[PDB]
């Protein structure tokens, strides 16, 4: 298992592991697509399975996402040229991330229905170190922990709104935690 920030192949498919070191975070790689992440007491880390470069895959996935406090289950990735975080939600803990945000517009997609949402993030930590850079969500109005994901749907739904995507990064279905401990896994294809 994985302690420690990185990236890599894993039966084919990519693999990011990021913390900035707080608490335990352990992430276990499995068959196929699996992962597995169990944390207590964490500061900040985002786990995953995935591809990149990524290309607007129709991602499909399943397992369980038990978290104790704030964490995020979301299709997540990045562009460059410009720099984007990026995050298709699919359930979370304790904090809904899009609180004080300005709401965009909707997107359904694969059954469900997604409120959007863009927010500058200032001298954060990213895939070109301490930058500025925004962030778009699509968050499902009513959580859920497995099915597909027509990634491609949701950036039509926010290029349609004026949000600019750069040349896809990763694209992982991430785990993330914040001042939290909880487990899940996750199996991506």
Not at 121 to 126: A, E, F, H, K, L
Not at 149 to 162: D, E
Not at 165 to 174: D, K, P
Request: hydrophobic share 25%.
């Amino acid at each position: 298992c994985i302690t420690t920030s990185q990236t890599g192949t894993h039966n084919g498919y990519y693999y990011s592991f990021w913390t900035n070191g707080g608490g335990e975070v352990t992430m276990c790689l499995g068959p196929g697509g699996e992962y597995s992440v169990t944390w207590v007491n964490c500061g900040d880390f985002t786990s995953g399975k995935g591809w990149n470069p990524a290309n607007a895959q129709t991602v499909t996935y399943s397992g369980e996402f038990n978290p104790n406090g704030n964490a995020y289950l979301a299709v997540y990735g990045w562009t460059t040229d410009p720099l984007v975080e990026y995050y298709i939600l699919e359930s979370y803990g304790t904090y809904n991330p899009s609180s004080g945000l300005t709401l965009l517009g909707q997107v359904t997609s694969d059954g469900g229905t997604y409120d959007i949402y863009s927010t500058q993030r200032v001298d954060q930590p990213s895939i070109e170190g301490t930058s500025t850079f925004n962030q778009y969500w699509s968050v499902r109005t009513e959580k859920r922990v497995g099915g597909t994901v027509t990634t491609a749907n949701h950036f039509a739904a926010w290029k349609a709104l004026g949000l600019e995507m750069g040349t896809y990064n990763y694209m992982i279905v991430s785990t993330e935690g914040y001042e939290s401990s909880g487990s899940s896994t996750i199996t991506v294809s």
